[PDB]
Design an enzyme around this catalytic site. Sequence first.
Site, PDB file in Angstrom:
ATOM      1  N   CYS A  92       0.853  -1.167   0.000  1.00 38.95           N
ATOM      2  CA  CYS A  92       0.000   0.000   0.000  1.00 38.95           C
ATOM      3  C   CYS A  92       0.913   1.249   0.000  1.00 38.95           C
ATOM      4  O   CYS A  92       2.065   1.136  -0.369  1.00 38.95           O
ATOM      5  CB  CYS A  92      -1.000  -0.069   1.127  1.00 38.95           C
ATOM      6  N   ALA A  93       0.393   2.410   0.334  1.00 36.35           N
ATOM      7  CA  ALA A  93       1.129   3.662   0.131  1.00 36.35           C
ATOM      8  C   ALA A  93       2.377   3.755   1.017  1.00 36.35           C
ATOM      9  O   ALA A  93       3.451   4.140   0.540  1.00 36.35           O
ATOM     10  CB  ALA A  93       0.219   4.842   0.319  1.00 36.35           C
TER      11      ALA A  93
END
Length: 130
Positions: A92-93
């Site tokens: 994810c980020a």
Amino acid sequence: SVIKIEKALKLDKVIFVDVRTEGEYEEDHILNAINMPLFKNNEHNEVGTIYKMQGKHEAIQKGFDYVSYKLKDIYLQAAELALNYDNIVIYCARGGMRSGSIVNLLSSLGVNVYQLEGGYKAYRNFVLEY
């Protein structure tokens, strides 16, 4: 359960799965990654705002509202990838709850997966390292 980008890029028969929105994946993603988005672009924004204004507890609730029905498909997509890749790296980020929850769940169901430490941010910093 967690893996650093320097090592992940060297795994044999590895697939990267990006759980960010379609918006974020389209802008830039890890080379050859596939997108399994946890949230639609609008869902993501609402979860973020809830997190800011209400905190984590309420943001998690909204997450369940948007993803609990998607979870069997996530399992089925991962089970399929597992027939074809020896190593599955989920990101994810920044390497928090979006990838962590998916990795932990998938792993308890017997699918061998890793969370990328530091998420996409760790990859960006690896590519741009001076």
